[PDB]
Amino acid sequence: PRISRHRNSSKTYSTPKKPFTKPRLDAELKLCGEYGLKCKREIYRARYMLAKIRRTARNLLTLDENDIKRRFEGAALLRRLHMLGILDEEKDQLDYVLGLRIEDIFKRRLQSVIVESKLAKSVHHARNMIKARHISVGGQIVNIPSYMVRISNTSRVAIADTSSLA
Amino acid sequence: MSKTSGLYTARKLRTVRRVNRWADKKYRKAHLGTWLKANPLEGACMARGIVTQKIGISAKQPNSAVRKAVRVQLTKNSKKITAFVPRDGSITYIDNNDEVLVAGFGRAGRAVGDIPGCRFKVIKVAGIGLLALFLRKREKRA
Amino acid sequence: GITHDKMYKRSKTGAVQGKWHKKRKYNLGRQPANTKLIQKISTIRCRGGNIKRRALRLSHGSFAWGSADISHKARILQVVYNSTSNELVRTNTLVKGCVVQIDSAPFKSALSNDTLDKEILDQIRGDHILARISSRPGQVGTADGYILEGPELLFYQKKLAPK
Amino acid sequence: ARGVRKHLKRLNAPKHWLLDKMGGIWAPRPTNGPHGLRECIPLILILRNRLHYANTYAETSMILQDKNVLIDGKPRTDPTFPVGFMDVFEIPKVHKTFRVLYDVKGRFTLVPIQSNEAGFKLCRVQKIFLGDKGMPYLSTHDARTIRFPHPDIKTNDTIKINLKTGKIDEWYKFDIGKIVMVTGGRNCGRIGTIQAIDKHMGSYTMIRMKDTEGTEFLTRLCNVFVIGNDSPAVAIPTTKGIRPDIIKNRELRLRSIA
RNA sequence: GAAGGGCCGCGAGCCCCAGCGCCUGGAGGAAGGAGAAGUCGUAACAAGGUAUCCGUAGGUGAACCUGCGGAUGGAUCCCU
RNA sequence: AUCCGGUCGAUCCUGCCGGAGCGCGACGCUCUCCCCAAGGACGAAGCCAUGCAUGCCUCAGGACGCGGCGGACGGCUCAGGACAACGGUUGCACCCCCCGUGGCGGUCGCCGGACACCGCUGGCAACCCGGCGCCAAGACGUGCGCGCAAGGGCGGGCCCCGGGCGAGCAGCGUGACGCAGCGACGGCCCGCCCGGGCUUCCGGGGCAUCACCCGGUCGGCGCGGUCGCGGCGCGCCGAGGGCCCGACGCCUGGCGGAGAAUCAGGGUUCGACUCCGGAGAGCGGGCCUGCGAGACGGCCCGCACAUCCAAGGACGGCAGCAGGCGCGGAACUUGCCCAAUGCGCGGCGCGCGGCGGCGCGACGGGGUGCGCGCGAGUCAGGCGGGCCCACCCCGACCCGCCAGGGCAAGGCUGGUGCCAGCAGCCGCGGUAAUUCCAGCUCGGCGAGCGUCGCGCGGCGCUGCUGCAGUUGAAACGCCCGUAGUUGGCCCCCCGCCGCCACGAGGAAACGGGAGCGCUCCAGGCAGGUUGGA
RNA sequence: GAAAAGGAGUGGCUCUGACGGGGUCAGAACUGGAACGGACGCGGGGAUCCCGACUGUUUACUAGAAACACAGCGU
Ligand SMILES: [K+]
Ligand SMILES: [K+]
Ligand SMILES: [K+]
Ligand SMILES: [K+]
Ligand SMILES: [K+]
Ligand SMILES: [K+]
Ligand SMILES: [K+]
Ligand SMILES: [K+]
Ligand SMILES: [K+]
Ligand SMILES: [K+]
Ligand SMILES: [K+]
Ligand SMILES: [K+]
Ligand SMILES: [K+]
Ligand SMILES: [K+]
Ligand SMILES: [K+]
Ligand SMILES: [K+]
Ligand SMILES: [K+]
Ligand SMILES: [K+]
Ligand SMILES: [K+]
Ligand SMILES: [K+]
Ligand SMILES: [K+]
Ligand SMILES: [K+]
Ligand SMILES: [K+]
Ligand SMILES: [K+]
Ligand SMILES: [K+]
Ligand SMILES: [K+]
Ligand SMILES: [K+]
Ligand SMILES: [K+]
Ligand SMILES: [K+]
Ligand SMILES: [K+]
Ligand SMILES: [K+]
Ligand SMILES: [K+]
Ligand SMILES: [K+]
Ligand SMILES: [K+]
Ligand SMILES: [K+]
Ligand SMILES: [K+]
Ligand SMILES: [K+]
Ligand SMILES: [K+]
Ligand SMILES: [K+]
Ligand SMILES: [K+]
Ligand SMILES: [K+]
Ligand SMILES: [K+]
Ligand SMILES: [K+]
Ligand SMILES: [K+]
Ligand SMILES: [K+]
Ligand SMILES: [K+]
Ligand SMILES: [K+]
Ligand SMILES: [K+]
Ligand SMILES: [K+]
Ligand SMILES: [K+]
Ligand SMILES: [K+]
Ligand SMILES: [K+]
Ligand SMILES: [K+]
Ligand SMILES: [K+]
Ligand SMILES: [K+]
Ligand SMILES: [K+]
Ligand SMILES: [K+]
Ligand SMILES: [K+]
Ligand SMILES: [K+]
Ligand SMILES: [K+]
Ligand SMILES: [K+]
Ligand SMILES: [K+]
Ligand SMILES: [K+]
Ligand SMILES: [K+]
Ligand SMILES: [K+]
Ligand SMILES: [K+]
Ligand SMILES: [K+]
Ligand SMILES: [K+]
Ligand SMILES: [K+]
Ligand SMILES: [K+]
Ligand SMILES: [K+]
Ligand SMILES: [K+]
Ligand SMILES: [K+]
Ligand SMILES: [K+]
Ligand SMILES: [K+]
Ligand SMILES: [K+]
Ligand SMILES: [K+]
Ligand SMILES: [K+]
Ligand SMILES: [K+]
Ligand SMILES: [K+]
Ligand SMILES: [K+]
Ligand SMILES: [K+]
Ligand SMILES: [K+]
Ligand SMILES: [K+]
Ligand SMILES: [K+]
Ligand SMILES: [K+]
Ligand SMILES: [K+]
Ligand SMILES: [K+]
Ligand SMILES: [K+]
Ligand SMILES: [K+]
Ligand SMILES: [K+]
Ligand SMILES: [K+]
Ligand SMILES: [K+]
Ligand SMILES: [K+]
Ligand SMILES: [K+]
Ligand SMILES: [K+]
Ligand SMILES: [K+]
Ligand SMILES: [K+]
Ligand SMILES: [K+]
Ligand SMILES: [K+]
Ligand SMILES: [K+]
Ligand SMILES: [K+]
Ligand SMILES: [K+]
Ligand SMILES: [K+]
Ligand SMILES: [K+]
Ligand SMILES: [K+]
Ligand SMILES: [K+]
Ligand SMILES: [K+]
Ligand SMILES: [K+]
Ligand SMILES: [K+]
Ligand SMILES: [K+]
Ligand SMILES: [K+]
Ligand SMILES: [K+]
Ligand SMILES: [K+]
Ligand SMILES: [K+]
Ligand SMILES: [K+]
Ligand SMILES: [K+]
Ligand SMILES: [K+]
Ligand SMILES: [K+]
Ligand SMILES: [K+]
Ligand SMILES: [K+]
Ligand SMILES: [K+]
Ligand SMILES: [K+]
Ligand SMILES: [K+]
Ligand SMILES: [K+]
Ligand SMILES: [Mg+2]
Ligand SMILES: [Mg+2]
Ligand SMILES: [Mg+2]
Ligand SMILES: [Mg+2]
Ligand SMILES: [Mg+2]
Ligand SMILES: [Mg+2]
Ligand SMILES: [Mg+2]
Ligand SMILES: [Mg+2]
Ligand SMILES: [Mg+2]
Ligand SMILES: [Mg+2]
Ligand SMILES: [Mg+2]
């Protein structure tokens, strides 16, 4: 067989069960307003990634406090959530992995980082400037709007010094 | 308990299930094969044939209308069916020997609405989709 | 060809069993030697090499008298008994286990030393001795053996009685 | 099939060969000889994939043509040559002499040694038998044979061999209390002391060892190679056959980047 | 030692007979279903104008009628 | 871990019908940029024009030929086959094996003629061959040699229990046969190895409108054949063997597993194709050569089909790669390269395998603006690449598809007047239509939307978890009764099952899962003392 | 129904086994124009319709049947 038959691939979003439901059909465009979202697949994707960390946490929390699998994956899960900035330092217990939301995932996009840093007038301006290739992340130039910035790479957001803007 | 129990009754709990599944009309309809036989399409999404006559069908008891249909002779097994031509005015695009493509109404071969005896419909005539043909996106030659 | 595959036999409940391949070479059978008494030894090439000697028309063999511990060579004279069938006796066909008469001339110097089995000595005074074939003529191209004694001798003499 | 197998798909290759699932549809298939097909690692996969002496098959071949690879004191020219446990690996142009041992995850490591060390070979006595005209032979785990063996040498013990003259100088006895290293199983690469040899009629005999920090383990007697007598006769890697557990390993993988 | 021949072992192909499916023609005959607004009566629902209904047997254009035993789901929870 | 609409004058139920989600294909409409990627499997295992798919190196400039090694591996497909095969788990004290590794090597004076390539003459329509002749061996043949191939007779203990074992197994000795193999460039032979054959146990489709079934069938003795055991075969003797814990028979649009789809838990359904195992090469059969084949890119015959031909004859097997026909709702080029990966032989060969082409099956990422700068294209140079190109880098120019009465988010003018038409289900339409046909306006998801068929879910409408049986569908008219299922209380601290835990031993890939910024990402196993736990 | 329908073997000679002197039954090798119940003796078969249930009786000398009788049934 050609060697390409052996590559893995996978879907990254889940579509809600009841589509035509007014109350959250409204709070769903509210999110497309408070950030610059092309369509609903980027809310679906955020729900998809929150669901998995929730499922892992419930699996671990069924278990017992002195157990090895807790001692392994709880520490791993908290470390990766803290370094992505989905969870902050003061909450170092697994039971806090349950009370997150989509919004704290959205907070660490570049479009949010540069608006905290005030590098763009707004979020829609931030989007257009992202694709114009004008903002770099620590000396390397990042074309991605959905880019997820570790709080280590979060001090080094700025204009890309090769740009019409220095 | 009106059901058998006890650690050594697995064989009976399986015999009961196997016998009682056939009392469900859907399980029997999808697993007995007599429908797979009686099905004019022989278990497919669609099939083609040649038109043998154009007919009109008088609607069922509450409504009143003359729906439009064609008697189709299937190519793959030489059977007779009737297909409802949808979408106002389309019955003109179905000549007396045409290769037409036939699919279903839904409901796995049950009559729909008020059209008696018809479980199929035509979706393409002479290589052209009838939706676009109605919508003036393609045109039959002459 | 001839085969000894089991797939053509029934199960242990009597049911016809199905057929899921074509004859394999490694289950072949061959026809048998049917070694006639009284000098050919064919060669057969078996699986992986392995010369097999296949006899036709043997005349002599090496025969051992055990209790006296004397061996001589001798000319098979006649096949007289066989446990399977009278047909292999009537045709003088050399197979393992058959009982034959051998020439007495080689063993006539044992007629001197006394305190020996008189049932062997008086038979040496004649002109043959009764013996059994111990080898497989169709597999190794040879027919050697031992002279009978014990209850077994008496058993075969009674089978040979003038009834 | 209708005969022997020549080819070998990459996925069907042994897991401990550490091949990568991309980079081909085929794998090198080891050739018959001094070791098997499962408990070995070929010469090409050592040179080309480990040490980068060659970046390709087409130039590993020529390294083996002008005879640059001494295995067990004798050269080799076959890329698919199976080198295994305790074999000596000396290339002179780069001044490197090794012996093959197992790591503590069941993989093949090349330990550096000295010219006072590459003069002998440890073999496991697989069996004692009789050949032509009634003579005794000992056949071992490296497919060496020794005739007229000293009667004290019995099955499952270990011998020490000279690579040049091919004769036995020392032997070690498999008893209760011998320093020994495993070669298969899920404790492959671990070293301990024989402290139980439990026998069973008809079936396999089981062996129970312990490291020098108290951790104990079990295996079949087919997987217990003897290395010394309360002291190893050959060198062993700076981990010495003690396995960490998953969390200790994880902190080390954290440290190496920290 | 070749061609060629004799007997058996393996085993095509065809013939011939029986089994075993599955599909299909057919004068007649007899059901079921839908379009129906066609005749003839009025069996049921009220004590439906002879309370209704079960089993069985017979009889009549049709629904149905009648005999023998049963039931209330009856039109009666009620009397030396 | 969720419901909704459809049986009334109104009302509570049962119960189905219809709607709402994911996936697989097919059809319709539409299409800016990049990355990944499946693709004549679907009761046609139907038929094939054309080309290619297997070669590489002892004896003389070289070819040619001889000799040798390989062509039994690799590729394709799923027709047959349901106590098979297959999966785990045993065994061979019933076996066979090339290459390679390590051993071992004792065997009762340089020989002989002849074959192909080639020379001279030929037959034939073409297919293919004849006759004569001069020439080699790491080719045969014979063989120089210190006796040892197969098989066979005797050499065991008459409570029972190291050469090697759990196990009387393997050697040796000694009486007879025989003369095999190795020797004209020293190898017969032996351990290991990978591979095979068979073999123990447990798992291993539907139908009872298939209840009895089998007769080398079940066992015993003896020979034969086999690499070998065995009713495997043959002779003789006996009457066994399987079965409601489902035999036997029939059917399958039956390849098995690793796995995949769905989604609280328990479950349902599918296992064409990536790895492993099996089986076949149009359909029955037979066989030669070889360590290894019942081989079809080997041969021989019967059948069904086709091909050239001067009419006498010869000849084929795409379920190999491309391509054609036919079938069907349904599936791409009659490309270039052996540079990597591997295998063969040895520097080459390889339609393995790779690299481009077709490719809205499907996956992942980014736009159609923001308040004033970009990508999409064009032209140049790198980088990469067997040769081009795509990605990256530097220079100069520069939506659409469905709907708007309810289920279910979204409401005025004209036309038509139970017509035409809509409508999955309720229902709409009778000359004032919230539903048809249109215009305006608004809703939905969005480079993708809609229609059709099927699987899972919805469904506690298949119920082990967990349904119902007075009247809605449903307790056999009753009593006895075998198989089956179930069975009070008691002694603890023994043995044998069940059960619970923890191990050992065997495959990756997939599924999870630790670490790692392909700019992110679907990914991959990277990478800056390392690592792939 | 039924010997349904349909198939195969069968001579001579040389032997072998089973039954408690006596033949029968079973098996094998060889052999003959490709023959064998070698003369003799000795059913052709099947699908249906009408009548009478059946075995039996009758027009000696042109009619053997569907006619008579019959068991059973009834008066
Ligand atoms: K119940
Ligand atoms: K129940
Ligand atoms: K029950
Ligand atoms: K019980
Ligand atoms: K039930
Ligand atoms: K055979
Ligand atoms: K075959
Ligand atoms: K074979
Ligand atoms: K295969
Ligand atoms: K084989
Ligand atoms: K082979
Ligand atoms: K692979
Ligand atoms: K691979
Ligand atoms: K190899
Ligand atoms: K190469
Ligand atoms: K009929
Ligand atoms: K009407
Ligand atoms: K009445
Ligand atoms: K009446
Ligand atoms: K009345
Ligand atoms: K009444
Ligand atoms: K009434
Ligand atoms: K009545
Ligand atoms: K009545
Ligand atoms: K009556
Ligand atoms: K009457
Ligand atoms: K009446
Ligand atoms: K009446
Ligand atoms: K009446
Ligand atoms: K009545
Ligand atoms: K009545
Ligand atoms: K009356
Ligand atoms: K009356
Ligand atoms: K009555
Ligand atoms: K009465
Ligand atoms: K009654
Ligand atoms: K009632
Ligand atoms: K559920
Ligand atoms: K409804
Ligand atoms: K309703
Ligand atoms: K009601
Ligand atoms: K209801
Ligand atoms: K196809
Ligand atoms: K096909
Ligand atoms: K196919
Ligand atoms: K199908
Ligand atoms: K070969
Ligand atoms: K071959
Ligand atoms: K091969
Ligand atoms: K193919
Ligand atoms: K198949
Ligand atoms: K099939
Ligand atoms: K081989
Ligand atoms: K090879
Ligand atoms: K087995
Ligand atoms: K078994
Ligand atoms: K088995
Ligand atoms: K089994
Ligand atoms: K059944
Ligand atoms: K028999
Ligand atoms: K036997
Ligand atoms: K027999
Ligand atoms: K018998
Ligand atoms: K069954
Ligand atoms: K099939
Ligand atoms: K279930
Ligand atoms: K579940
Ligand atoms: K489950
Ligand atoms: K379910
Ligand atoms: K469920
Ligand atoms: K496929
Ligand atoms: K396959
Ligand atoms: K497969
Ligand atoms: K595979
Ligand atoms: K395979
Ligand atoms: K295979
Ligand atoms: K295969
Ligand atoms: K096969
Ligand atoms: K076949
Ligand atoms: K064929
Ligand atoms: K075939
Ligand atoms: K064949
Ligand atoms: K064959
Ligand atoms: K064949
Ligand atoms: K096929
Ligand atoms: K095919
Ligand atoms: K191609
Ligand atoms: K077509
Ligand atoms: K077509
Ligand atoms: K290559
Ligand atoms: K190719
Ligand atoms: K620009
Ligand atoms: K540009
Ligand atoms: K510009
Ligand atoms: K510009
Ligand atoms: K536009
Ligand atoms: K419409
Ligand atoms: K529907
Ligand atoms: K509905
Ligand atoms: K109007
Ligand atoms: K359900
Ligand atoms: K459920
Ligand atoms: K109940
Ligand atoms: K009722
Ligand atoms: K009923
Ligand atoms: K009852
Ligand atoms: K019952
Ligand atoms: K009862
Ligand atoms: K009872
Ligand atoms: K009872
Ligand atoms: K029981
Ligand atoms: K039960
Ligand atoms: K029980
Ligand atoms: K009980
Ligand atoms: K247990
Ligand atoms: K593997
Ligand atoms: K005769
Ligand atoms: K008469
Ligand atoms: K008579
Ligand atoms: K008469
Ligand atoms: K007359
Ligand atoms: K008369
Ligand atoms: K008469
Ligand atoms: K008559
Ligand atoms: K008369
Ligand atoms: Mg592969
Ligand atoms: Mg009345
Ligand atoms: Mg009345
Ligand atoms: Mg294919
Ligand atoms: Mg499967
Ligand atoms: Mg082939
Ligand atoms: Mg071709
Ligand atoms: Mg078609
Ligand atoms: Mg359910
Ligand atoms: Mg009569
Ligand atoms: Mg008369």
Author numbering:
A (entry chain J1): 2 to 167
B (entry chain X1): 1 to 142
C (entry chain I1): 2 to 39, 50 to 174
D (entry chain E1): 2 to 259
Quote the study that presented this structure, word for word.
Giardia lamblia (GL) is an anaerobic parasitic protist, which causes an acute human diarrheal disease called giardiasis and poses significant health and socioeconomic problems in poverty-stricken regions worldwide. As expected, we found that the GL ribosome comprises an extremely reduced version of typical eukaryotic ribosomes, missing nearly all of the eukaryote-specific rRNA expansion segments (ESs). In contrast, the ribosomal proteins are typically eukaryotic with some species-specific insertions/extensions.
The initial data included 260 691 particles, yielding a 3.1 Å reconstruction of the entire ribosome, which was further refined and Bayesian polished to obtain an improved density map with an overall resolution of 2.75 Å for the entire particle. The final density map accounts for ∼92% of rRNA components (18S, 5.8S, 5S and 28S rRNA), two partial tRNA molecules, and a total of 30 and 40 rProteins for the SSU and the LSU, respectively. Inspection of the density map indicated that two tRNA molecules bound to the 99% of 80S particle; however, while the E-site tRNA was more clearly visible, the density for the P-site tRNA was weak, implying either high flexibility or partial occupancy of the sites across the particle population. We compared the inter-subunit bridges in GL to those in known structures of eukaryotic and prokaryotic ribosomes and found that most of the previously reported bridges are well preserved in the GL ribosome despite the lack of many eukaryote-specific rRNA ESs. However, the only case of a protein–protein inter-subunit bridge that is missing in the GL ribosome is that of eB8, involved in two contact points between eL8 and eS1 in the human ribosome. These contacts are absent in the GL ribosome; therefore, we propose that this region may be targeted by compounds that would not bind to the human ribosome. The structure analysis of the GL ribosome revealed an evolutionarily conserved architecture of the known universal functional sites, including the peptidyl transferase center (PTC) and the decoding center, which are formed by the rRNA. However, using modification patterns of the L. donovani and the human ribosomes as references enabled modeling of a significant number of modified rRNA nucleotides in the GL ribosome EM density map. Most GL rRNA modifications, although not all of them, are localized in and around functional regions in the interior of the ribosome rather than on its periphery. Taken together, from the evolutionary aspect, the GL ribosome appears to be a ‘compact’ or a minimal eukaryotic ribosome.
